[PDB]
Design a binder for this molecule. Sequence first.
Ligand code: HEC
Ligand code: HEC
Lengths: 126, 126
Amino acid sequence: QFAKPEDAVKYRQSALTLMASHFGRMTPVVKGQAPYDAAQIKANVEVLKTLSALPWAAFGPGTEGGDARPEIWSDAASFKQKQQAFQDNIVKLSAAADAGDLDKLRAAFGDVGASCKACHDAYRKK
Amino acid sequence: QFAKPEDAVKYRQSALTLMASHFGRMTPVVKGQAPYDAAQIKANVEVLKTLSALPWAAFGPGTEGGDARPEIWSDAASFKQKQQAFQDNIVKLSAAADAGDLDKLRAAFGDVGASCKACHDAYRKK
Ligand code: HEC
Ligand code: HEC
C-alpha cells in the first residue's frame, strides 16, 4: 500500500508510536499508581492487539529507512521470530486483561515490555 | 495518556496517518484497478474501524498544536458533529464490507471520503 519506501517508513513509525502509547499508558495501572478498572484495560488491550499486528507489513523488502537496521531484511526469519514472540506475548496480555486479573496483567505486561526491548536492541538503529 | 500537549499532537497525527493509509489503500479496489477480494476488504475495514475511533481523544482541551485549528476547541459540539458523522459513515462502510458488496462498498467509501474532507476543510489549518 506504499507508493515509495518513505511511505512504509512513515506508516510503521506511526503504528509503533500508537502501540507504544497504548502499551505505555498502562504503566501507572500496573504499578498501582492509577486505579485498575478491568473493563477499561480490557478495551485498551483490544486496541493494542489490533495495533500490534500492524507495523510488520510495513517492513517489506527494500523498505530500508528510518531507524530500522538492515539486518531486519537480511535476517528475515530471525526478525520474524522477534515479531511473532512479541505478538504471542500480546496474546497473553489479552488473556490477562480479558480475565480481569491485575496480577496476571502485571506479569504479562512485563513480558511484553521485555519483548519490545529485545527487538529494539537487535533491530533498531542506535 | 499524554505527558505534554506535544504528545497528544504526535499521537493524533500518527493515528490519522494510519486511518488515512487504511482508507486510501482501498482506492484502487473501489476504482476496479485492483481486484476485489471481499475477505481482504472486510479485514481491512475492521482495522480502519478501530483506527477511526482513536484520533478524537487526543484533541483534549488545551492540546492546540500541530495542524489543528483552535476552533476544534471553542466549537466543541460542532467538531464532535463532524467526528461522529465520520464514524457513522465508517459504520456504513463496515456494513458494506461485511456484506461483500462492491457497489455498496464504492458508495460507502465515497461517503467516508466526503466526511474526511468536510472536517479537513473546517478544522485543519491551511
Ligand atoms: C521488532 C519485532 C519490534 C518490536 C517487537 C517492537 N519494536 Fe519498536 N521499533 C522497531 C523498529 C525496527 C523500529 C524502527 C522503525 C523505523 O523504521 O524507524 C521501532 C521503533 C519504535 C518507536 C519509534 C517510532 C517512531 O515514531 O519513529 C517506538 C516508540 C517503539 N518502537 C516502541 C515500541 C514498543 C513500546 C514496543 C512494544 C510494545 C515495541 N516498539 C516493539 C522494532 C520493534
Ligand atoms: C475531523 C472530525 C476529522 C476527520 C473526520 C478526519 N480528519 Fe484528517 N485531520 C484532522 C485534523 C484536525 C488534522 C490535524 C491534526 C494535527 O494536530 O496536526 C488532521 C490531519 C490529517 C492528516 C495528517 C496527519 C499527520 O501526519 O500530520 C491526514 C493524512 C489526515 N488527516 C487524513 C484524513 C483522512 C484520510 C480522513 C478520513 C478517512 C480524515 N483525515 C478524517 C481532522 C479530521
